[PDB]
Symmetry: none
Subunit: 240 residues, 3 copies
């Protein structure tokens, strides 16, 4: 019917989608700086205040921990009861959701330029410096490789140990996460106008030219077609 | 009497009107990336190479410098002899001509969402955020239909062959990806404030009005409840 | 492979050059629907909210009223203090700037097919119906005849009372304003690839064939030579 079941009021705009935990608790971040945990009936289970607006959806670990990045520059790990498990400070805002690896390692990009890998107990496992701010979420390959784009124009493939597997130079800032095809091909769009297809070894498979910047990730069809939007007003379907 | 006096070939389409200098010189930008200076007899005085297509007409200051924006993202200041005076870098393409203040400041807009005021020596006086139009990744239904929301305010349903299956008109730009439910209902938020529920055939099933723009995708719970946040501060829970 | 399977136009957000008032204020219309008044120091003087994107530059009249068309269908009249003086509702989006006659009448085209004549107090003096959307501003000859091209392919010559003086058929949509020579000749470019020169009585003086569509208005040199760019790649100089 499309009728309102309930509405929950936070202090400022909600910019990131909510996420539902396994017991039905709904979590949403708000530009008022708080992460909210809402019961299915619409009543606040708890709030948790960070220092500034939360732009990115939170992410839930298998033990129920809630991970959220804040414009205050910290990644917060929050217990299911709303108490603080730990906080991990990067130097500038965190604009995109963290990602959790198989072993529970939490990867998060920061506007300070680094990709951070954080242990389940909150200590730094390592950092990886790039040229400029990281705007989009990292993506993990089937073999444990962590791919991350940077406003430095480069796509970085990072080993689980923190060392560089390789980098790939595009002409201009990358604003969106890459996507991994069925055969390990890594697709990523750049402000240079090109959609790039990278082989798992870091070599360029091909590149597809549009007229203006590509600002959202591509998505891959059942038959492997890659669909990408461009700032030139078109959606492109590209043969593999 | 309508006879050809001459013709001047460039690389690609000429999109904008030419501009005539004080001394009869005709300036014209080309999609070929170049700014051409043509003499009154049709011979070429000089050309000037930008990195990408020029879409808009150049402007001439009082001292004769020729200003021209390019899709390469730079505003170029050209001396009357055809040498570069300076260049001013923005993040994305410049699609409209600059305009010049009385004190000689050059104002230009960029696809990076800003209006730039540039001092006549090519340094930045200030910038003003004018609002970037955002677009989101497309989404694919399980029958193959590709769904993408547009800054013109439509959700487009595109068939796998590239033909339009239908379009659904919302009142303002759609900034976040649609989300499809079990029964195939297509959910999408608009900057007009509504969450829309579309049937697979492109007809409206219902609409749910919130106070302000919806900027992030909705999420469906396991019992069918639709959750969505709004720029009005609320997270709304909606029945199917 | 990496070759293009197809492309689909999803609607490009258009923006127009800013306009400078006589006190120094810079005016820009935005994708988000606002007209922004920016002080010369880069601070915001005010913002005026329309319902959808503004695609054409504002125009300022004698008394300082600021006129701006919106994709919400309305032509707006704003006071220098950013208050609404009046609004005028057309059937569809307004894509090109208005023009002000010598007697203060405000002329504007609409995607609904009509050219509207509006009094400085917001009431409708008349409306002229053409077959398809009006994409480019009208032009006023020195005897007060108002010329407007239309996507229906005709150039229309309208008397100041709103009655058709004459129409002139070209083969396809006219996208660019016409231009009037000193002897009264009306020059118009068509998507049929021809530059038309039209006598004040609506008879055809001549036509000049380029290879592809003409997207921008011709410009007349001081010696009468007509310059016009073409999508065929050339700039043409044509004798009067």
């Amino acid at each position: 019917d499309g009728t309102e079941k309930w509405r929950f009021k936070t202090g400022k705009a909600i910019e990131a989608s909510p996420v539902i935990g396994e017991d039905g608790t709904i979590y949403v971040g708000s530009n008022d700086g708080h992460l909210y945990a809402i019961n299915p009936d619409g009543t606040e289970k708890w709030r948790f205040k960070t220092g500034k607006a939360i732009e990115a959806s939170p992410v839930i670990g298998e033990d129920g921990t809630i991970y959220v990045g804040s414009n205050d520059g910290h990644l917060y790990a929050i217990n299911p009861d709303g108490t603080e498990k730990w906080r991990f400070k990067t130097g500038k805002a965190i604009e995109a959701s963290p990602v959790i690896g198989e072993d529970g390692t939490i990867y998060v990009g920061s506007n300070d330029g680094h990709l951070y890998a954080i242990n389940p107990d909150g200590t730094e496992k390592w950092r990886f410096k790039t040229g400029k701010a990281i705007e989009a979420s990292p993506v993990i390959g089937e073999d444990g490789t962590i791919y991350v784009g940077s406003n430095d124009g480069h796509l970085y493939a990072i080993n689980p140990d923190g060392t560089e597997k390789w980098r790939f130079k595009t002409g201009k800032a990358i604003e969106a996460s890459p996507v991994i095809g069925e055969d390990g091909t890594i697709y990523v769009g750049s402000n240079d106008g090109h959609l790039y297809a990278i082989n798992p070894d870091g070599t360029e498979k091909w590149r597809f030219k549009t007229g203006k910047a590509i600002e959202a990730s591509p998505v891959i069809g059942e038959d492997g077609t890659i669909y990408v939007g461009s700032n030139d007003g078109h959606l492109y379907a590209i043969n593999p």
